[model samples]
Target: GNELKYIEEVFKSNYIAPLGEFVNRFEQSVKDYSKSENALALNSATAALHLALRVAGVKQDDIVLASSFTFIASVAPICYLKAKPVFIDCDETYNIDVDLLKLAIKECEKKPKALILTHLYGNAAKMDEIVEICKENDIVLIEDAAEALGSFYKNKALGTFGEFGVYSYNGNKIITTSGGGMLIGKNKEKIEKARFYSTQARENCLHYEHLDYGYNYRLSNVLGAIGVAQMEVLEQRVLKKREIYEWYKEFLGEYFSFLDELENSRSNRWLSTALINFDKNELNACQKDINISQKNITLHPKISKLIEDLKNKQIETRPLWKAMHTQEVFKGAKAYLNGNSELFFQKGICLPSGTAMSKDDVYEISKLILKSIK
Candidate 1:
């Protein structure tokens, strides 16, 4: 896009330092888009989450409630804070289950100081209800909106519903700043505290002075420039994603009888997903057998076999992330569950939803998918 021109102009100014106009502008742009009173650019969403937990005064031995169905980045900060993470399960929509959260609050021996909520796969969690619940429990809410940059709940941005919200700008996200993240909130003081910590906790003085532990989490000016450029086309990118989802929905409408349905939630349509169902005994009798073509040869679709089939056809797809509770690193970590996320992990398949994808690309992928199912 023409946005590169602005980045080129920034380069011409020779302000390649971290404290440059590009950083300031990018920060402002984040605030404006998210409708938050304040925003700060960070090197990564993990750094932003760490800083948020730090400012919220999380410490060793403290208990923090976090979503069980999210990426490692959402829960990694709790480990950084030396806090115990009590995993909460997800609702049907794949967002943190607020009902389970309430139950976790009551069951914990000690009150959790923070609740790290992630809006998984661009699906807006029950923000209003979750906020009320958090307030009632007197818990700090740190929202990890890494997969939900353009998602909203009741017209309000998804990340802004918490005390602190963080968005990732990784290469696969809705919009890429190459590799960056943004911290946002309505509280000016909290926002400033994050900035201070991210900037190495230097005191306001002529000489360098540090009163507490700090980190170099500030986003680079070069990345900030890219973020500014990415912001310009965010809306268009979001529209394309939604269109891709709609196309899949229309094509696979009848398959819902065998597959799971999306929950009562609005999604940014970050990734299109469908569950697979197969019966070993009925394989021969089934009219729609799962077989896909690989280099003009047809083969039965084993889950592993289907992936190879897609790759052979130049179509990229992925299995859903394994649940946090299932990970080896957190083997002993306690998790509250009713098997919702387990069902999601066992059956879900993520289709290619790149913004750069075209109608032909979608058609080709869908052809393979439909053929495999049939």
Candidate 2:
């Protein structure tokens, strides 16, 4: 809690710029925490992503395959590279389905040079299979681990499983660097290249020698101080987040079918989710009398209605991401869909699971949701 000491020290040192001990310490701390061979801190995750693509040789006309069920920030960099994005739908776990990705690659006319996979909502994207797919196809794997800082897969951190893993330390994340991101990877050389680009691509020269185009993507020293302080409390933030998920489930699991679907997932519990299956009867609970809904009912609560209900009650909930390929910005991009992403968007609602919420808060929110549906 006394992490404010660093802020005071920064002020005392007059290190208001983006270069100082805090920046170095923050980057080192991330590398150490992730066990990454190298790490580069930047002003934003977008900058880190852009540099990763640049180093991956994503030139004009290149195709990059990315998860369809993710935030716009994940796919925007492909457009920055003048590269096209091939959208791949997610699986039941709300992660990029590896099988679907393989199928898309097989049918596409050209091979993709990179695959940007988001650990969506802090859930791992079946990284083992995805990594194999990328390696075999010679595609560089860049992990958007923005929502998964302390999350792991098979005991290893989620982001480190790929060639380049990026973390966001925005205010809303598990930890806040205020406004900063870090890129981590095992390839020291590639990490160095990213660092070069992050720092205006300054060549080893007396003057500003720009070998190629680069960006002013370095993180500010003041923000890095916050990041270092935030890292100190990150583990606690994760534990609190997980506890909130457990609390929500414990309070409301029996009232509906939400927990049953979640039983299949080992989520980071970033945001607790529950499905509202309108269809009543199931084969598991039935004899010949079992008759499911005759109508083609939407499986989960209507996302729009759920959001409106939550807002009306002063509770916060968000609909799942809109499929990137369906966005007007990506109107011309080809999307490989099994209708999974659309279904998720229409049915899913992300309940507020901020670490600050108490057990009572979750129960109250759940009550509002149930009342709305009834």
Q: What is the TM-score of each candidate against the true structure?
A: 0.89, 0.89
lDDT of candidate 1 over 1-374, digit per residue (tens)? 64577678778876454456788988888888889888989999999899889888899999998887889988999998789888877776677777677877888889999999998888888887899999998999989999899888777888898999999998889888788999997689988999998888999999999898689999987788889888888888888988888777677555521232244434677887765663223221211111112112122244445567788888887776666766766756667765566566655678899988888878778778777665
Candidate 1: clashing pairs of residues: 289-374
lDDT of 2 at 320: 70
State residue 311's C-alpha deviation in candidate 2, in Å: 1.6
The Cα local distance difference test for each model comes to: 0.78, 0.77
Give the count of colliding residue pairs in each prediction.
1, 0
lDDT of 2: 0.77
Query: For model 1, what is the C-alpha lDDT against the true structure?
Result: 0.78
Error of 2 at 152 (Å): 0.5
